From a paper:
We report the crystallization of the full-length HIV-1 Nef after experimentation with naturally occurring Nef variants from patient samples and were successful with one such sample. The protein adopts the elusive closed tetrameric association in the structure. The asymmetric unit contains two protein chains that associate through symmetry to form a tetramer. Surprisingly, the tetramer exhibits 4-fold symmetry as opposed to a normally expected 222 symmetry when two dimers associate together. On the other hand, the N-terminal anchor domain is disordered in the full-length structure. Compared to the dimeric association of the earlier ‘open’ form, one subunit of the core-domain swings out with a relative rotation of about 174° and translation by ∼22 Å with respect to the respective center of masses. Further association with another symmetric pair leads to the formation of the tetramer. This leads to the steric shielding of the PXXP motif in the tetramer. The Arg105 of the earlier Nefcore structure is the first residue of the conserved XR motif, where X is either R or K. In the tetrameric association the Asp125 (Asp123 of Nefcore structure) now interacts with the second R residue of the XR motif. Thus the Nef tetramer can selectively abrogate the recognition of SH3 domains while allowing for interactions with other subsets of its repertoire of protein partners.
HIV-1 Nef is an important accessory protein that is attributed with multiple distinct functions such as immune evasion, virion infectivity and support for viral replication and survival. Each Nef chain folds into two domains. The C-terminal core-domain functions as the oligomerization and protein interaction domain. It contains the PXXP motif (Residues 72–78) that recognizes SH3 domains of partner proteins and other interaction motifs at a 30-residue loop (Residues 149–178) distal to the PXXP motif.
Author numbering: 74 to 149, 179 to 203
Write the structure that this text describes.
Amino acid sequence: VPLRPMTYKGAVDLSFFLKEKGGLEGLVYSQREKEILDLWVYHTQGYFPDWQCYTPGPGVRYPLTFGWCFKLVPVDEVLKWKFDSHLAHTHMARELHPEYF
């Protein structure tokens, strides 16, 4: 498909797709593993890969983009992808760090 920007509408439906149909959930996070993912999504769905960002360490990393419903939790610093459907409702990345926005 053609080329388009991530949108909340889109982000949400995506968050679903991946959860619902396959294993991102609980996947150890990594730089490349992210990146790969980006493109993948892109090739898959023509989203310009500039929307997959999370808040900085320590602890739980919150997706920057409102409506992308995955965060990165620690293991016991090591991060695993986790799905959470409330980040559809709460834009955590925002109260935590309104500076960027």
